[PDB]
């Protein structure tokens, strides 16, 4: 297995530097994932900007917002596209957190992403060849 916590941390750190923010916290996998999420981001750019504006992120709504969106995303199953959208969505929440002067939310979202990966996505990811199979498919 690849360490999903490390995959979350590297991706979130990457996304925040894309916005000019600097967040203190296998390389082929990290690069392939960031490329797929970037592609997805650019493909649906206007949609994600509109989502951002409706997020209404506060410390009291963030946890439930993350959980409800992610449970809907995977409601009837998992595939690699939904895994990419999951990283995109978590990244959008982290960006909104720093943009709204709630940068401590970033650390919480990263943990919620890591926890969802390990609690709900690990079996599917492993059953389907692990992150190496993602690299082979998106490469």
């Amino acid at each position: 297995g690849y360490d999903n916590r490390e995959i979350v941390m590297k991706y979130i750190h990457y996304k925040l530097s894309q916005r000019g923010y600097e967040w203190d916290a296998s390389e082929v996998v990290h690069l392939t994932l960031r490329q797929a999420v970037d592609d997805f981001s650019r493909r649906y750019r206007r949609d994600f900007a509109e989502m951002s504006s409706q997020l209404h992120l506060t410390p009291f709504t963030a946890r439930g917002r993350f959980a409800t969106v992610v449970e809907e995303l995977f409601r009837d199953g998992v595939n690699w596209g939904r895994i990419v959208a999951f990283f995109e969505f978590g990244g959008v929440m982290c960006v909104e957190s720093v943009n709204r002067e709630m940068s401590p939310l970033v650390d919480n979202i990263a943990l919620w992403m890591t926890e969802y990966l390990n609690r709900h996505l690990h079996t599917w990811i492993q059953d389907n060849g692990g992150w190496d199979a993602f690299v082979e498919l998106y490469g």
Binding site: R43, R65, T68, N79, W80
Partner: peptide, 21 residues
């Protein structure tokens, strides 16, 4: 409510995106 709409749209886009691999 807002979250259920976000999730459905995300799901729509994911399944489109996965097909483009």
């Amino acid at each position: 409510w807002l979250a259920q709409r976000l999730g459905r749209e995300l799901r729509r886009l994911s399944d489109e995106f996965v097909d483009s691999f």
